[PDB]
Design a protein around this ligand. Structure first.
Ligand SMILES: CCCCCCCCCCCCCCCCCC(=O)OC[C@H](CO[C@@H]1O[C@H](CO[C@H]2O[C@H](CO)[C@H](O)[C@H](O)[C@H]2O)[C@H](O)[C@H](O)[C@H]1O)OC(=O)CCCCCCCCCCCCCCCCC
Ligand SMILES: CCCCCCCCCCCCCCCCCC(=O)OC[C@H](CO[C@@H]1O[C@H](CO[C@H]2O[C@H](CO)[C@H](O)[C@H](O)[C@H]2O)[C@H](O)[C@H](O)[C@H]1O)OC(=O)CCCCCCCCCCCCCCCCC
Ligand code: CLA
Ligand code: CLA
Ligand code: CLA
Ligand SMILES: CCCCCCCCCCCCCCCCCC(=O)OC[C@H](CO[C@@H]1O[C@H](CO)[C@H](O)[C@H](O)[C@H]1O)OC(=O)CCCCCCCCCCCCCCCCC
Ligand SMILES: CCCCCCCCCCCCCCCCCC(=O)OC[C@H](CO[C@@H]1O[C@H](CO)[C@H](O)[C@H](O)[C@H]1O)OC(=O)CCCCCCCCCCCCCCCCC
Ligand SMILES: CCCCCCCCCCCCCCCC(=O)OC[C@H](COP(=O)(O)OC[C@@H](O)CO)OC(=O)CCCCCCCCCCCCCCC
Ligand SMILES: CCCCCCCCCCCCCCCC(=O)OC[C@H](COP(=O)(O)OC[C@@H](O)CO)OC(=O)CCCCCCCCCCCCCCC
Ligand SMILES: CC1=C(/C=C/C(C)=C/C=C/C(C)=C/C=C/C=C(C)/C=C/C=C(C)/C=C/C2=C(C)CCCC2(C)C)C(C)(C)CCC1
Ligand SMILES: CC1=C(/C=C/C(C)=C/C=C/C(C)=C/C=C/C=C(C)/C=C/C=C(C)/C=C/C2=C(C)CCCC2(C)C)C(C)(C)CCC1
Ligand code: OEX
Ligand SMILES: [Fe+2]
Lengths: 341, 37, 52, 451, 35, 334, 136
């Protein structure tokens, strides 16, 4: 009837890719985060920001290419193309590291626009919105690492660059400087990721091994029409199996599939709380009862004090080349070496 | 390298160990042309 | 003496009488049912359901 | 088309060679075609390994794996691991290449024109999987060949040329095995050792007299057991324990071939007798001892008493004492104190490294050997740059031991998975429930209350 | 220490022999299909 | 009638509370001895010379530790790969000093887990199930045998084996990074994709079932009580969740087949952990990951740094500091 | 950016400087990594770390070894660091090239380019050459 109704009926039309209202936020912003990454890893260097090479023009393969974080002198500037740093020039915008905030900002509005996509399709199909709530897990890892972690730090420079090996140094930068593995929020996150991979490997292998005979063929994939009301695997058998192997087992398909939602997602929320606590440098660095004892008793050694000496090697050896803006000129005689290494 | 009566065929020999991989791909090409039936 | 090249780790002679009386004490249990059966009765199955 | 779609058989295209279980001509043509590929690779790889051979670099720096098996047989090898000729390596790679064109033609004949079942026309070759007299005959015929193939090593090491002994007195050279060891307390001494450190179950054969004397007993067993399974029939206990079907025999092999898969992958890491360090490069244990021996020579020239040289931990910096009492090298190399190598065994005694022989008799070929085996340690990378994991990109070396111990070991786990898949199906195909649970008769419902 | 050692080889080849003579005890026939 | 047949009937009975089976004949004695020694060695066990340099590393709770730092320490560098049982130790005090209980726990663990795996087969045979849950459990058995068995073999000592603890795990992972460069190795890459993908398809499948549940309850009681146990009606509209994901990405990327869907949940992690556990195995024999250090040069020939060179300087920090007293010679061959 | 001023290296004990043609610097790298680089990788010596390929360490040898003519002198006749006795029996050389199979096929221009690589590499990388793992 009205003008709003014609636009509402056009976006929600059955077509190849469902656009909806949320596609106006997703499809422009996701296309430019992805294309900003493919351009930045192919053409744009890191020679002026980090003093590296992170492009395909500079000989890096898929692994050692990245879209890199800007300089520490930029601080937390948004680095707009028209801004006071770039001033409209495209070429000087790329050399400062403007594509990285271009990827991260238009990417953050892609994950907004993709989670709104999951509320919109669920309302048209008419289902409960648990996909949009389980996808809030990965939103809490993007925001609290690519956005909330460099905000608490000195600049955008201490953020993960969007490249394969550039994530890998961020894994190593976070052990030596922060002791991230000791943090109980990672420990509750590893329990959800390795726990979530566990549940789909079991529920994959128990459904597929309690199937009913619905055909004479040896292939069991053929014997399932999608609109049938009979269940395709014996729940009573699978309960009787695991009650004797493992001792305790699900007797509820509604509780089972909810539990496959809770375990992976909670590991992304609990691990997201800790990385917000490392923006503020509130790290779980030391057990002081272990540290006061190892200072007074020069014979008491645990595995825990062995990890601190591994972190002095990370804090001293890479920090010269890690942070060229700070100009660490270490002598050879201050770098902690071991015996004969 | 190869003996002097065989130095001519030094490019062809370099391809030869790859050829057993090409039999693995020959099965799928044959399954595509048969229509996977 | 760890890195000696001795059979099944049998260092002393006394450990043999442990091994022989372990396999045989259950072998004799096993022969109480599956022993003393007909060793000449066949089948054209994949699997035999003969007796206890 | 009948027999070659899912409507006739019940197997999809991806599990398509499972249609060959209950046809015998198509199955025979498949096993002789894959045998045509095993041959064809080995002929074509050696020709590839000959055309890239350079006499300047050593045999292991050039990254070959197949022309070093023939040098252990003794073709074209000189004294000290120096490959001389490389005309006989050309000859072997052609016989294993021409012959695959014949085995290739059997795979294309027997599987495209041969009868589907041999049991109709050819009653000698035709069979059934459920038959137990025929299957032990097929096992028996193909065991007497593995007996005869073991004597070809023994004939070649005693009569036809000899084999390469790296322990040969005067240097490693092609040596006729005159007097092999035929003692079953010694030969089966290996088979019943511990697999752990120091004993090292079957890897630790340390001279060619036990190797060639051992392959005699293999030929004795595989012929008597070949004749045993031709004449006889499986006993009462053997008929009750197995599943006599087609896939069950395949999952019996896949368990045993994984045993051979791990063991050949552990020969290549530790053994320096069947795999000479002159050919395959130094072992993992050997390059750890060659470092400590090199700096032993280095600081002995500075007038330092190396026996009384107190280490930084309080142990021996150079010479310390093993937990069994022997004089060994010190460092992280104290774990590899069982390293028995032809360039360090001149310095042994009853006690271990003789201190009098270290102070006086170090020969410069041992210094040229320990410096060669330090710089070519088996530590590499997948892009084939050597050194430690933090080495810069200048050298191009990964040891051929690290390719064999990481690829046959790689396969030997997946063939253990093949024992798990193919025997889970074959035990359940014998029982009837491999297609799923019957809806009319579920076995769990006719049981006790659950508790 | 050679008295403990005797006790272990009893316990190992007790249970190993229950394993070996378990599957020799007509073990494929113990299925819910028949017998 | 016989005593053995009345014992085989009990040990293979599915009417027991826990199925014992013939693998339980060597699962239960193995894992109860790995357990009962672990609880004692974690709580009350004296310090252990791990580096072989007679510097004993404390690992138990009574010697001033906690849950995080306490760990069953691996055996000595002095022993190395040698089999070290109690009777080959001349006292228990000499056994506990040199890293005794690490070999007693690990060897009774790997036998009991490889028997727990075969026990999952056996009950599937006696219940009429298709058999292959135990093939999915091969993937953590591959990974447990990689860090406790295969990596001490190729490195030649149980002292390089993984410490049974929590802080000992991260001593294991970091030292494995400096010496082998696991992150650049494509098999750790193929299993990070296995568990990120595994936790994706877990929470993606578990949401689309819970989204499309059928009304069987009221708003006061729980959602889960609309499933009665052992019912034969399907508890969710699978056509509904297919039409949702058929619009969320596109139409042809959606499994309408629930059997092929529930197979892909078992494929992706298990293949990802088979491949990963053969990354530790091929890096046990010093076939390390990629090494792109000093790979990008200018025309003058000066080394231009990359991200791998920054990653290298993190590896050089751990390499020069791990086992800071055990080394005497310039190259960590072990 | 391989300028001829950067390719110009010192050639004799007096101090004359000649330039290296661009095939000398290319064969000089391939031959050095194939022959010498097993132990002398990046200027350090694996089997004797005191005696490196540093331009400081080559200069302090009792015959001065910085020159191209002095390095090819060392290859055909390797004395020690103090130059009193010969270690041709243990270092690979031309004089003792029956034991080392790696040096049976080397011409004069091939050693001229290998010694060119040892001399021109501290001019490219000032501190990485023979600086150990600190300067990787
Ligand atoms: C939930 C779902 C979310 C959905 C995703 C939505 C994504 C949208 C993207 C958000 C855009 C945020 C980036 C804005 C830039 C930024 O932040 O820019 C940062 C600036 C602050 O600027 C910084 O300010 C600092 C303070 O300096 C001051 O103090 C100094 C010493 O006192 C000197 O005196 C200096 O002169 C003086 O300016 C330093 O100057 C830094 O160099 C300068 O960059 O604030 C600002 O723009 C705004 C900050 C105030 C708003 C606070 C909210 C945002 C910050 C949250 C994080 C708080 C930190 C907690 C860590 C956890
Ligand atoms: C079983 C499956 C279930 C897993 C449970 C594991 C617990 C089982 C009980 C423990 C058995 C452990 C096996 C020990 C293997 C080992 O230490 O093996 C090492 C020995 C090699 O022995 C070495 O042998 C060497 C022999 O060398 C000597 O002799 C040579 C002679 O040339 C050289 O001279 C050399 O220099 C000299 O030192 C030394 O003696 C070493 O000390 C000694 O360790 O290999 C050999 O036994 C041969 C190879 C055996 C196969 C190894 C397979 C590994 C299994 C991994 C499976 C992963 C999948 C699990 C799925 C489930
Ligand atoms: C080791 C590799 C190998 C081998 C030897 C075989 C062999 C066979 N497969 Mg097979 N297969 C394989 C891998 C292999 N497969 C793989 C990896 C897959 C998964 C994609 C399949 C899937 C598959 C299916 C789905 C089916 C088979 C079938 C067959 C059999 C008959 C084929 C036939 O009659 O069709 C005719 C074949 C052709 C027309 C192919 C022509 C290609 C020619 C032979 C190539 C020759 C090239 C060579 C260089 C020439 C040398 C000549 C010589 C003179 C030098 C045959 C025994 C069929 C079967 O079960 O039979 C009952 C069947 O249904 N296969
Ligand atoms: C293990 C492999 C194997 C097996 C079991 C068979 C089995 C069979 N083939 Mg076949 N074949 C094979 C390989 C094999 N073939 C190969 C490799 C080729 C290519 C050359 C052929 C080519 C071929 C043709 C062209 C024909 C057969 C035929 C037959 C059938 C009758 C053969 C006959 O008359 O027996 C009696 C035959 C003999 C006694 C002659 C034996 C002579 C050989 C050279 C002795 C072998 C020497 C030695 C054992 C091998 C050592 C090498 C080894 C280490 C690899 C029979 C089922 C025929 C058939 O089915 O009829 C339609 C037929 O026409 N085959
Ligand atoms: C490729 C190798 C191969 C394969 C697959 C087979 C396959 C088979 N053999 Mg065979 N065999 C082979 C080589 C092979 N054989 C060789 C080379 C020999 C000569 C030594 C034998 C000697 C042989 C005999 C004597 C018997 C078999 C039997 C069997 C059947 C399975 C039994 C089994 O595996 O128990 C595995 C069992 C063990 C590894 C341990 C068994 C321990 C025995 C039973 C203790 C009793 C002492 C006994 C007299 C042997 C003394 C040695 C020592 C243990 C004291 C099966 C058909 C049995 C059969 O049914 O005969 C037809 C049988 O009785 N085989
Ligand atoms: C029809 C529509 C098609 C839709 C296309 C959608 C766009 C998405 C495509 C994403 C591709 C991202 C991968 C980039 C890889 C790249 O280009 O490397 C290209 C690089 C370029 O190669 C490098 O080139 C340099 C030039 O100086 C140097 O020579 C380096 O040595 C050389 O490696 O190649 C590699 O690094 C080699 C390995 C490539 C490995 C790529 C696969 C890795 C796994 C990623 C899989 C992504 C899945 C995509 C699925 C779609
Ligand atoms: C495929 C995966 C890889 C498979 C393993 C590969 C085989 C490894 C080699 C095995 C060696 C076998 C040699 C005999 C055993 C040996 O000597 O050990 C004997 C060794 C030697 O034992 C030690 O020896 C020393 C001498 O140097 C000292 O004397 C010590 O006191 C003594 O304990 O001890 C052990 O290793 C005991 C192993 C106990 C494991 C038994 C569990 C097996 C149960 C499996 C079920 C049986 C079914 C399989 C049988 C069919
Ligand atoms: C590198 C890419 C990785 C492998 C690429 C293809 C994936 C595997 C596809 C075939 C799977 C085989 C197949 O599809 O079987 C599917 C199987 C049920 O299949 P059916 O019984 O319907 O039929 C399979 C056979 O019985 C023959 O029809 O499901 C399982 O039992 C799952 C339980 C094991 C769960 C773990 C499975 C992991 C095994 C995968 C390792 C396979 C390598 C061999 C490939 C043939
Ligand atoms: C030798 C081998 C013998 C088997 C060994 C036995 C060990 C089994 C462990 C028991 C799990 C008990 C947890 C109760 C849990 C409980 O009772 O749940 C009971 C629940 C049954 O749910 P139903 O379907 O009955 O629920 C329907 C509705 O009523 C939902 O409320 O079963 C499961 O969902 C458990 C599956 C995950 C199992 C979680 C196990 C996590 C591992 C344990 C983590 C703790 C280890 C800490 C050590 C420091
Ligand atoms: C930045 C920027 C921009 C732009 C944007 C865009 C427009 C972009 C796009 C772009 C794009 C969008 C890109 C793409 C790329 C792609 C690529 C380059 C791909 C590649 C691929 C590959 C290489 C792969 C491979 C493979 C294959 C082929 C098959 C098999 C498998 C594999 C995976 C291996 C603008 C203007 C706004 C401005 C601002 C800034
Ligand atoms: C050449 C040589 C040699 C020799 C060799 C020998 C002489 C060998 C032997 C071998 C042998 C002598 C082996 C054995 C093996 C055995 C086995 C491995 C067994 C197995 C078994 C089984 C598998 C069983 C199973 C079962 C059970 C347990 C229960 C029931 C069921 C059944 C029956 C299935 C030497 C050392 C001098 C050195 C080097 C060279
Ligand atoms: O023990 Mn445990 O960590 Ca395998 O690397 Mn060599 O050893 Mn000792 O150092 Mn580094
Ligand atoms: Fe499900």
């Amino acid at each position: 009837r009205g003008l709003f109704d014609l636009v509402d009926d056009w976006l929600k039309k059955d077509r190849f890719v469902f656009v909806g209202w949320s596609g106006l936020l997703l499809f422009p912003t996701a296309y430019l985060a992805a294309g900003g990454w493919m351009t930045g890893t192919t053409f744009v260097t890191s020679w002026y920001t980090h003093g590296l090479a992170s492009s395909y023009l500079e000989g890096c393969n898929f692994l050692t290419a990245a879209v890199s974080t800007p300089a520490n002198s930029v601080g937390h500037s948004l680095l707009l193309l028209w801004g006071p740093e770039a001033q409209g020039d495209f070429t000087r915008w790329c050399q400062i590291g403007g594509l990285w905030t271009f990827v991260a900002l238009h990417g953050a509005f892609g994950l907004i626009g993709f989670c709104l996509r999951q509320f919109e399709i669920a309302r048209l199909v008419g289902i409960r919105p648990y996909n949009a709530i389980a996808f809030s897990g990965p939103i809490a890892v993007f925001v609290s690492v690519f956005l909330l972690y460099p905000l608490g730090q000195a600049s955008w420079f201490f953020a993960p660059s969007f490249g394969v090996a550039a994530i890998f140094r961020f894994l190593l930068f976070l052990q030596g400087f922060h002791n991230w593995t000791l943090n109980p929020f990672h420990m509750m996150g590893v329990a959800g990721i390795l726990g979530g991979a566990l549940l789909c490997a079991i529920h994959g292998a128990t459904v597929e091994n309690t199937l009913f005979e619905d055909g004479d063929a040896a292939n069991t994939f053929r014997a399932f029409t999608p609109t049938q009301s009979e269940e395709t695997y014996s729940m009573v058998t699978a309960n009787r199996f695991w009650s004797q192997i493992f001792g305790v087992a699900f007797s509820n398909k509604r509780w089972l599939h909810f539990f496959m939602l809770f375990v992976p997602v909670t590991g992304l929320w609990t691990s997201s709380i800790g990385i917000v606590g490392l923006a503020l440098n509130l790290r779980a660095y030391d057990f002081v009862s272990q540290e006061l004892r190892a200072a007074e008793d020069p014979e008491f050694e645990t595995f825990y004090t062995k990890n601190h000496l591994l972190d002095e090697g990370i804090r001293a050896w890479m920090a010269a080349q890690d942070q060229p803006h700070e100009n660490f000129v270490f002598p050879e005689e201050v770098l902690p070496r071991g015996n004969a290494l | 390298r190869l003996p002097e009566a065989y130095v001519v065929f030094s490019p062809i020999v370099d391809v030869l160990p790859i050829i057993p991989v090409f039999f693995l791909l020959l099965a799928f090409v044959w399954q595509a042309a048969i229509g996977f039936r | 003496t760890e890195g000696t090249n001795e059979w099944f780790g049998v260092d002393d002679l006394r450990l043999l009488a442990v091994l022989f009386l372990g396999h045989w004490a259950i072998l004799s249990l096993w022969l109480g049912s599956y022993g003393d059966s007909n060793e000449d009765e066949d089948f054209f199955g994949e699997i035999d359901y003969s007796a206890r | 088309i009948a027999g070659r779609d899912i409507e006739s058989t019940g197997f999809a295209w991806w599990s398509g060679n499972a249609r060959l279980i209950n046809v015998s001509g198509k199955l025979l043509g498949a096993h002789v075609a894959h045998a045509g590929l095993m041959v064809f690779w080995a002929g074509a790889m050696v020709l590839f390994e000959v055309s890239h051979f350079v006499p300047e670099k050593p045999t292991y720096e050039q990254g070959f794996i197949l022309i070093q098996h023939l040098a252990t047989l003794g073709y074209g090898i000189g004294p000290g691991g120096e490959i001389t000729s490389t005309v006989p390596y050309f000859a072997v790679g052609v016989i294993h290449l021409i012959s695959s064109a014949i085995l290739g033609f059997g795979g294309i004949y027997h599987s495209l024109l041969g009868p589907d079942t041999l049991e109709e026309s050819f009653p000698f070759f035709g069979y059934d999987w459920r038959d137990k007299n025929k299957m032990t005959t097929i096992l028996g015929i193909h065991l007497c060949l593995l007996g005869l193939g073991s004597f070809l090593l023994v004939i070649k090491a005693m009569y036809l040329g000899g084999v390469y002994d790296t322990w040969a007195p005067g240097g490693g050279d092609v040596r006729y095995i005159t007097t092999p060891t035929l003692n079953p307390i010694v030969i089966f001494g290996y088979v019943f050792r511990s697999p752990f450190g120091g004993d090292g179950w079957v890897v630790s054969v340390n001279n060619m007299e036990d190797v060639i004397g051992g392959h005699i007993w293999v030929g004795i067993l595989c012929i008597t057991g070949g004749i045993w399974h031709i004449f006889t029939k499986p006993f009462a206990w053997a008929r009750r324990a197995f599943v006599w079907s087609g896939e069950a025999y395949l999952s019996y092999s896949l368990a045993a071939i994984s045993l051979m898969g791990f063991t050949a992958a552990l020969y290549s890491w530790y053994n320096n007798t069947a795999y000479p360090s002159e050919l395959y490069g130094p072992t993992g244990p050997e390059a750890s001892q060659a470092q400590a021996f090199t700096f032993l020579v280095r600081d002995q020239r500075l007038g330092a008493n190396v026996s009384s040289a107190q280490g930084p931990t309080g142990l021996g910096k150079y010479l310390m004492r093993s937990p069994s009492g022997e004089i060994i090298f010190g460092g992280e190399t104290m774990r590899f104190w069982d390293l028995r190598a032809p360039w360090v065994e001149p310095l042994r005694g009853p006690n271990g490294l003789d201190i009098n022989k270290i102070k006086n008799d170090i020969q410069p070929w041992q210094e040229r050997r320990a410096a060669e085996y330090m710089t070519h340690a088996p530590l590499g990378s997948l892009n084939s740059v050597g050194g430690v994991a933090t080495e810069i990109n200048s050298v191009n070396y990964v040891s051929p031991r690290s390719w064999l111990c990481c690829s046959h070991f790689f396969l030997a786990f997946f063939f253990l998975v093949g024992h798990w898949w193919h025997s889970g199906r074959a035990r359940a195909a014998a029982a009837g429930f491999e297609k799923g649970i019957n809806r009319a008769n579920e076995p769990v419902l006719s049981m006790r209350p659950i508790d | 220490m050679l008295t403990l050692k005797i006790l272990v080889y009893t316990t190992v080849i007790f249970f190993v022999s229950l394993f070996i003579f378990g599957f020799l005890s007509s073990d494929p026939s113990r299925n819910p299909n028949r017998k | 009638v016989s005593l053995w047949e009345r014992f085989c009937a009990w040990i293979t009975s599915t009417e027991n509370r826990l199925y014992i089976g013939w693998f339980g004949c060597l699962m239960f004695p193995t894992l109860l001895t790995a357990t009962s020694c672990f609880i004692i060695a974690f709580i009350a066990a004296p310090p252990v010379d791990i580096d072989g340099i007679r510097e004993p590393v404390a690992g138990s709770l009574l010697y001033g530790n906690n849950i995080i730092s306490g760990a069953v320490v691996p055996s000595s560098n002095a022993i190395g790969m040698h089999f070290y049982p109690i009777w080959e130790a001349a006292s228990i005090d000499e056994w506990l000093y040199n890293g005794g209980p690490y070999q007693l726990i690990v060897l009774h663990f790997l036998l009991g887990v490889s028997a727990y795996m075969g026990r999952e087969w056996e009950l599937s045979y006696r219940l009429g199930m298709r058999p292959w849950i135990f093939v999915a459990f091969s993937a953590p058995v591959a990974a447990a045998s990689a860090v406790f068995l295969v990596y001490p073999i190729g490195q030649g000592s149980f002292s390089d084996g993984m410490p049974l603890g929590i802080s000992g795990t991260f001593n294991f992972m970091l030292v494995f990074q400096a010496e082998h460069n696991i992150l650049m190795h494509p098999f750790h890459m193929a299993g990070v994709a296995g568990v990120f993908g595994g936790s994706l398809f877990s929470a993606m499948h578990g949401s689309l079932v819970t989204s499309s549940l059928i009304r069987e309850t009221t708003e006061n009681e729980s959602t889960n009580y609309g499933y009665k146990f052992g019912q034969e009606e399907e508890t969710y509209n699978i056509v509904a969740a297919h039409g949702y994901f058929g619009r969320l990405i596109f139409q042809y990327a959606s499994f309408n087949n629930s059997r092929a869907l529930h197979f892909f949940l078992a494929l992706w992690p298990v293949v990802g952990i088979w491949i990963t556990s053969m990354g530790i195995s091929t890096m046990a024999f010093n076939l390390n990951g990629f090494n792109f250090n000093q790979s990008v040069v200018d025309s003058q020939g000066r080394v231009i740094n990359t991200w791998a060179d920054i990653l290298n300087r993190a590896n050089l920090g751990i390499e020069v500091m791990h086992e800071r007293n055990a080394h005497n010679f310039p190259l960590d061959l072990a | 950016d391989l300028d001829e001023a950067t390719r110009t290296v010192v050639v004799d004990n007096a101090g004359n400087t000649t330039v290296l043609t661009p095939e000398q610097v290319k064969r000089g790298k391939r031959l050095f990594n194939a022959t010498c680089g097993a132990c002398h990788v990046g200027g350090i010596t694996k089997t004797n770390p005191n005696v490196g390929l540093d331009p400081e360490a080559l200069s302090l040898a009792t015959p001065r070894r910085d020159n191209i003519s002095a390095l090819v002198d060392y290859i055909k006749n390797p004395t020690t660091y103090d130059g009193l006795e010969s270690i041709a029996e243990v270092h690979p050389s031309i004089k003792s090239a029956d034991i080392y199979p790696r040096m049976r096929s080397l011409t004069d221009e091939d050693l001229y380019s290998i010694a060119g690589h040892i001399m021109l590499s501290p001019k490219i990388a000032s501190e990485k050459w023979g600086g150990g793992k600190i300067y990787y």
